[PDB]
Design a protein around this nucleic acid. Sequence first.
RNA 1: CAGAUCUUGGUGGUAGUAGCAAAUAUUCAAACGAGAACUUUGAAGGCCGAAGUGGAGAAGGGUUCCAUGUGAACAGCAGU
RNA 2: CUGGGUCGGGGUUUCGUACGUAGCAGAGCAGCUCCCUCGCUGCGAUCUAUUGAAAGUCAGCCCUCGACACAAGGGUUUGU
Lengths: 60, 49, 131, 63, 107, 49
Amino acid sequence: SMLRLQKRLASSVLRCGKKKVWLDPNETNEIANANSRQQIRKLIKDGLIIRKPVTVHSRA
Amino acid sequence: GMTHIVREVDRPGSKVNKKEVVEAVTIVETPPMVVVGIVGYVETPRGLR
Amino acid sequence: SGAKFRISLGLPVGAVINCADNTGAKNLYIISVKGIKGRLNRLPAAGVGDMVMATVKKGKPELRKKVHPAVVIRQRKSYRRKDGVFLYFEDNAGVIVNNKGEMKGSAITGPVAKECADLWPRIASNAGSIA
Amino acid sequence: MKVELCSFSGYKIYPGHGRRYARTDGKVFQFLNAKCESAFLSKRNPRQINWTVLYRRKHKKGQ
Amino acid sequence: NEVVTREYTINIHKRIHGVGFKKRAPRALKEIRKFAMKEMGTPDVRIDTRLNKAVWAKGIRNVPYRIRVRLSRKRNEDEDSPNKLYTLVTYVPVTTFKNLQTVNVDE
Amino acid sequence: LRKSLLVQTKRRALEKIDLKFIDTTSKFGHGRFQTVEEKKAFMGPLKKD
RNA sequence: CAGAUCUUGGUGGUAGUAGCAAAUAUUCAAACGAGAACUUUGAAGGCCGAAGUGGAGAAGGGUUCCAUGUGAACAGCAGU
RNA sequence: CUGGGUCGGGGUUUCGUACGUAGCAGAGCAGCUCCCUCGCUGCGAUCUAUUGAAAGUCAGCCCUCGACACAAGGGUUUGU
């Protein structure tokens, strides 16, 4: 299935580039029928997707 | 393969007489063969048969 | 006898070789090896111990600007003896000579290849050390 | 045949091997290979090099 | 039997000698699949993603000379396939590679 | 190998040869040690003993 | 009508040939699916390296925007 | 003729002495002393010992008889 739509919405809601969005890989079914920002905003709070942290860039 | 050798030489008159020389050689390993068959040839005006 | 077993020719026409005697020259400019018949489009090459015509390009004004026969003493190209040791000196070298085969100067600095000392006995008389 | 010790190492040079280089002040030296060739021609001190015979004899290594 | 599982030490420096630089790691994979298919004989080989990290770890221009591989054949244990058998390759990290044999292991 | 047709009579082909040194150092690199028994004597003991 | 380097339409040999080589690079697993070198997710390795392979505009395009679906045709292989 | 295949082992060979630890080594500086004083603790490029060590070694090198499994099969034909 095309999880692209869910990825773009998960970037706008989280306010981060879609590199960082992490759609869960084992649960591609429940995301597939969540295609409105009234559910993806819900779908985050249950942890089924999250925002990946920035890759480290150490000045040490 | 190939390998060196060192020998004297006794060519009379050469500027190399009675001195060492090194000379690249081969090594052709030759186990003894085994005879199994005989063939006879007859001369024909056409050729050998 | 007259053996001169092939030694790797390493100074083609154009080689500038340090003069090695007291005639006052400092550079021999080879123009043509002596004794080479050659092939279409091949520069003659002068080995060690080969008479070779040469025009001094830097030294006594008497010597410069004329063609003098020369002999190559030390060559930089590693040449083989006939016993498997590849002797090669530190620089090109030479010495002015008459076409009768005898030196013009009387003091050679540096070593001399054993190939020369066997060929031109006049050079082998003045050689400091036949290396 | 005569064996000639290297001038940058101690390894024996058998008659077929090596190459010989004679500077323009009257000294011939034997070299076993090209590794010992361009070490001397760069003047690297033959006793600061961890594999020569001279170095192994200087620190008395093995003795 | 037909569920036999055993270690191996795949030498991927002699299956790679003589290849270009951008096609070195991707060639290491096929030389692993040409290993399972020759050893076990089954035509389904499923390289575990932990291995794909372990063969790309250095880069693509350089791959570890020896990689230690556990060839666990299976009988469609947790799947169902048209082929009855398929070997699931796996990674067995080790700090040394001296005096290691191809020993068998408990199933 | 085949015995020769061209009869040889020159000096160079009627030579009697007695060798002096059949070189046997390794060809798999610039060899420097004729025999193993010689190699271990110049090196000595190792950490692999 | 045999022709005019004739007009229009059509078909060959060439030919399954030239070719699909400008800018470093892809791999492993999983999903729907009839089908997967290419689609989507995840893991890894790379690049564009802020005078950008980034974020917005003016000319110009005019519905390409967004969603659901399709496997005629086009996307010089393929394609969910 | 048991066969070769893989891993390991040694021989060769390439480069030059690994990580780790210890040193009353180490040009100096800093902190603390019953101020003893080459006293004690620290940073310190490097050198020394363990160390011809470490690593690669056929993919077109050699020998093994050590571990492992595999090995006589499958498809297309041909008649005086």
